[PDB]
Amino acid sequence: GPISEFMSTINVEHTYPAVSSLIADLKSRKVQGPFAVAVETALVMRQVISQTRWSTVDQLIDTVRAVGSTLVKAQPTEFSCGNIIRRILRLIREEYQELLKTADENEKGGMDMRAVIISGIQDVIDELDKINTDIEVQSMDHLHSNEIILTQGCSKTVEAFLRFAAKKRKFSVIVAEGFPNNQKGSHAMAKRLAQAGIDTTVISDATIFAIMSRVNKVILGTHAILGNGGLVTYSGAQLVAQAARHHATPVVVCSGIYKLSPVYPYDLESIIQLSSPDKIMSFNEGDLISRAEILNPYYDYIPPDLVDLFITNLGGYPPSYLYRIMNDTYDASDTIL
Amino acid sequence: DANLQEKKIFEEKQVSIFSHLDWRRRRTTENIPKDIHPAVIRLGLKLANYKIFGSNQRCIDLLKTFKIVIQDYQTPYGTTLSRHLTTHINSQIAYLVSTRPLSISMGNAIRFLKLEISVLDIDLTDDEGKELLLEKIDSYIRDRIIIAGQVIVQAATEKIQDGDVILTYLHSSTVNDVLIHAKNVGKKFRVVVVDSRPEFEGRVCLKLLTEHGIECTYVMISALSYIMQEVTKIFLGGHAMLSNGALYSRAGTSLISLLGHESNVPVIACCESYKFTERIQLDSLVYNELAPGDQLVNMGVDDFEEKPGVLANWKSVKNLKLLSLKYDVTPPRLITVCVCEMGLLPSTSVPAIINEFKQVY
Amino acid sequence: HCRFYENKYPEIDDIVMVNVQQIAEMGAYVKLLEYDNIEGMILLSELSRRRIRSIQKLIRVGKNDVAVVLRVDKEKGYIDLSKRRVSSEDIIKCEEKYQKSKTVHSILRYCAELEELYKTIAWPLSRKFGHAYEAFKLSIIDETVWEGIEPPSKDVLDELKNYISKR
Amino acid sequence: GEFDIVQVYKKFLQDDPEITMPVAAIEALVQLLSRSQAKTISEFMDILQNGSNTLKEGVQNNISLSAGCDIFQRFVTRSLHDVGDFEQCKRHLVENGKLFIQRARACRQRIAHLGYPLIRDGSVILTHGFSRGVAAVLLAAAKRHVRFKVFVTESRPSGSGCLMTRTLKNACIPTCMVLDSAVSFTMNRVDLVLVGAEGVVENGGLINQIGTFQLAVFAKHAHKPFYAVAESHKFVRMFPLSQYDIPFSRPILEFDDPSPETVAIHNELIMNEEQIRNNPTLDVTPPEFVSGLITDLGIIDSKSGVSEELIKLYL
Questions:
Q1: In which residue ranges of chain D is CATH 3.40.50.10470 found?
Q2: CB-based contacts of A174: which residues, under 8 Å, 6+ apart?
Q3: How far is CA B342 from the centre of its chain?
Q4: How many C-beta neighbours within 10 Å does residue D272 have?
Q5: How far is the C-alpha of A68 from the C-alpha of A66, rounded, in Å?
Q6: CA angle, D229 then D233 then D235, to 5°
Q7: How is domain C1-86 classified at the CATH fold level?
Q8: DSSP strand pairing (A231-234 vs A299-302)
Q9: How far apart are CA D182 and CA D154, in angstroms?
Q10: Can you cite an annotated GO cellular component (chain C)?
């Protein structure tokens, strides 16, 4: 049940324009990354709420769902889209059921709750700029001096996770650049980690198995978490988990909660995305680019039975408890969009 | 001074793994502050000097003592009871922690009582406030522990089968309280009692079960490989269950579970609910509590019997240090069941139960 | 063993002290001692509210508790009760009223060496002053409250007059 | 009125085979509730227990329905309150009863609408024995036009394998019956294994036919995912410590005691009907070997979330 069944593509552009403008920005990867998708997904629905007129609540939850179903097929793999939607849907039917009852409680039809949703939407937006700032503080219960740590590729959440510990504890981290797609940011992170007083070492992606033998913990940042606790993460992370489990090395995941999604990884081949081979082999090698098959995926699936701990804005939680974070944050009716 | 000590407590993050574990213990009443209730003194002495001090009886004696503190409390005329009472109590904890670190059991009790003080109705009076939370405490001792124990033992003994060979380790009053039941309900079985150095806590378990007429077998932990071939079930009483499903009990508890699983015996964890913790531990070294190293100098089959050894000068010889951790964590892949008062749950289901009590709106 | 009050069964919206026997998948098979320990059922939902993820906290087994009656089917023996809807005060009015009856029955069970004695003495006397106890002490400060008393024999009857001395 | 209930139960099986034993049991009690006319809640739940245990002792104390019955009681038992008019009881009773049957019969379809996306174009599945749940997910996939192949276990001693392969073939689905002793050799070919469940356990276990754990470990050793389909009315409140801690109707796996008395393919060489009855009927797979559980409550995988949902039921 998408939106085009409700509103004509042209009148959508007049009623809620930013929606139609977002889909373009969403398919063209003008806005990628789960955070940038998340915050922009919210404040788009802000204007939507501030622009739709309606009478009964069942109009909204059927309307806002419909735009979401298209807002997903724009680029579905950027999961943070629906997660902001699915959370909004519960946000209204909670604000509904609380008001429909507190009015019944005032006893011996007022769709003017739009500004409450906006006060509820902006609440979740303000939570996003409060993702790392309340996650970085969990380090001092996990990072300790003289320990050896391994991560992979740029991940500011993990970056801020360590640097907070570096304030008082001195220790060492090991960085595996996320070749080919996380190369740039990963190098930068290590250069920043060095300033904070962290014996940081940059290694090729293939040097992972070698050094893990003397690694205490591995910290990882993901691109999203799926309904089975599995991980969709930027390329080359399974190399770390598989090398970790081979050494009984604990695996820790520092992720926000807006990436936690209930969609179930049915077929992986419809999850991973494939970027341009230009990041792997130069266009000049013309003989090769013709005679061969060149692929550059930039996601990676690691199964849930491989993560030992989840650092979230709500706290540390085993993977076998993620579901209770879902049902306390979403609604099973909104699994599919 | 405290910040000066806090500077010291920073420098204790050096090459040694156990650099951070706190060794500072006060075992005497020298230089005690005045605001320390007598019944607290007698407790702090029992904490630092007792050894068969189960994590349950501690929480009880702590609460029963706390009643006597509150009962004798006297708020200043210029301030109601709720305001400026934790401050008094907080000044009691800081003493008790200096005798021996707070157990997980004791801690959550502090966190609970500190809460009910806050939510306490201001429009009451002293004798109204006091008489109230003394029941809250007595209720906490009723529902959270004593009754919960009686549920566990009955729930645990149900899975005891005639012909079993039970293995406990290092005297868990709960685990003793279930075997004695299974004896009195008519279950036909026998017990293996695994003990270990330095304070052989297992003998007192052997003493109890023997005085109840239970076939018992006593071996040190070094005989686990030898003795597990007869065992069919393993019963463990924990000091706490982590939120990841791990079990936080005494030292050998990890090996007991490990050696058992590699011989296909189940690890049954009997632990109450108030001993659940919102925290998690990847290694048995980040969060722990030490015992004095001197206790394993007197190498003999005794500990008080002052017969020396070769390591008596370890404190004075460089490149030599003795230590004895008191707890370690056991991964949940080794724990088979947790026997909370909500029934037999899988250990991984702990944090939900923790979040279940947070229904306190 | 015997019955307490002349009504073989309690009426709806009475309040009865009752001892729990066992708890099953559906309710709590209780037995009311004010009517010769006859059985009755209390629905799970009508038990005191719970506070645990799973309550097998059956501390109350062999426990004397209070309850209100909902339905009665005398021809078949079933009784339905409820513990929740009992107020936090009339319970005491039952407890205050209970032990009086327990005290009275305690005297005849001694003399049980009873159903007749209720027929002869208890219930009609309670029918005269509302309840036995509420004037049972007056039998020492008065005798005209014995208007219409015909025991089976003055053999052990006067022993009562000598037994109201004790208590 | 009607005294024998098992007959009612026995009727619905012939009135419709597409419903399983637990489903009919609910339809019986609802009939038992409606055609009854009690006067006290005690009487109402009394005949319930009698009606339940009668059905329980009726079948060989089966688990799939003894589950369903116990849920049905502790369903209607909640939210039950007598308010003024007594008939509200029986009304709220049987009215909520058919409501449970509504969710009951509709569970087999709801799971299929969640299970078929597991089946992917060109994949290959493995199923042990016959399971109506495994049927729907496969067909609804095939009925939605997707190419896949399926192995089927011989399913001794129930032999239900010979039936399940037929049930698929009648829907244009390739089938290759594999001996019970040859699932290992089959694995490297399979992409995913899918089985039914005769009962689900507090620990997230899986009480099903005798061979499930046999191939649940192979899936582990072959790193191929293991999926199981189970309806909510099969969550049972028991807890085994090992893959053997289940109640035995008949004493199983006993040894003969002899005494000095001397007395390719060989399909006709099998155990007698007496030896088979000595072998066990059921088998339990611990939760570490199941990648996920397909229920009307959704796809469950935590194996601590099976308990929350299970605890949500029995109350």
A1: 113-313
A2: A148, A149, A150, A151, A200, A201, A203, A211, A215
A3: 20
A4: 8
A5: 5
A6: 75
A7: OB fold (Dihydrolipoamide Acetyltransferase, E2P) (2.40.50)
A8: antiparallel
A9: 10
A10: cytoplasm
Structure determination method: X-ray
d(CA B311, CA B106): 35
Q: Going edge to edge, which strands form the sheet with A172-176?
A: A201-203, A172-176, A148-152, A217-220, A251-254, A309-312, A315-317
CB contact under 8 A, B286 and A316: no
- Chain D residues with beta carbon closer than 8 angstroms to that of A335: 298
Helices (H), chain A: 9-15, 17-27, 34-49, 57-73, 80-104, 114-128, 156-166, 183-195, 208-211, 238-245, 286-291, 322-327
Q: Name, in order, each residue with C-beta under 8 angstroms of B245's C-beta and a sequence gap of 6 or more.
A: A318, A320, B331, B332, B335, B346, B347, B348, B349, B350
Q: Give me A297's structure tokens.
A: 């995926």
Which tokens in the block code for residue B279? Answer: 């925290």
**Cα(D67)–Cα(D77) distance, rounded to whole angstroms?**
16
Does chain D reach chain A with at least 3 CB pairs under 8 Å? yes
Q: How many residues does chain A have?
A: 337
End-to-end CA distance of chain A: give it in Å, rounded: 8
Q: Does B361 touch chain A (CB under 8 A)?
A: no
Q: By three-state DSSP, how is residue A24 classified?
A: helix
B356 contacts chain D (CB < 8 A): no
CB-based contact D211:D283 (threshold 8 Å): yes
A167: nearest CA partner in chain B? B10
Do residues B207 and B240 make contact, with C-beta atoms less than 8 angstroms apart? no
Q: Which chain A residues contact residue B282 at CB under 8 A?
A: 142, 217, 250, 252, 308-309
Question: What are the chain C neighbours of B353 within 8 Å (beta carbons)?
Answer: 53
Contacts of residue B248, defined as CB under 8 A and 6 or more positions apart, other chains included, come to: B104, B238, B239, B240, B241, B242, B277, B281, B327, B328, B329, B330
Question: Interior CA angle at D301 toward A269 and A85, to 5°?
Answer: 65
CB contact under 8 A, B345 and D302: no
Q: Which token pair is D33?
A: 């509730």
Size of interface A-D (CB pairs under 8 A): 30
CA distance to partner chain D, nearest, from residue C157 (Å): 43
- Domain C87-167: which topology? DNA polymerase; domain 1 (1.10.150)
Euclidean distance between CA atoms D189 and D198, whole angstroms = 27
Topology alike, domains C1-86 and C87-167: no
Q: Directed axis angle between helix D132-142 and helix D107-115, to 10°?
A: 50
Q: Kindly list the domain boundaries of chain C, sorted by start residue.
A: 1-86, 87-167
Record the tokens describing residue A75, joined without a space.
């680029």
Long-range Cβ contact pairs of D275-280 (< 8 A, separation 24 or more) = D276/D157, D277/D250, D278/D252, D278/D253, D278/D254, D279/D157, D279/D210, D279/D252, D279/D253, D280/D210, D280/D248, D280/D252, D280/D253
In which region does residue B133 sit, left (phi positive, over 0), alpha (psi from -120 to 50) or beta (all else)? alpha
**Which CATH number among 1.20.120.1070, 2.30.30.40, 2.170.16.10, 3.10.150.10 corresponds to the domain D5-112?**
1.20.120.1070
* Residue A125 structure tokens: 């937006």
What stretch(es) of chain D map to CATH 1.20.120.1070? 5-112
Residues A173, A194: Cα–Cα separation, whole Å: 10
Superfamily designation of domain D113-313: Translation initiation factor eif-2b; domain 2 (3.40.50.10470)
Please tell me the distance in Å from A58's CA to the nearest CA on chain B: 30
Strand-pair category, C78-82 with D148-153: unpaired
Among B141, B272, B342, B345, which would you mutate to test the C interface (most chain C Cβ atoms within 10 Å of its Cβ)?
B342
**Hey, what are B269's tokens?**
């964890």
A21-51 in b/e burial notation, b at 16+ Cβ within 10 A? ebbebbeeeebeebbebbbbbbbbbbebbee
Q: Look-up: residue for tokens 């007129």? A: A53
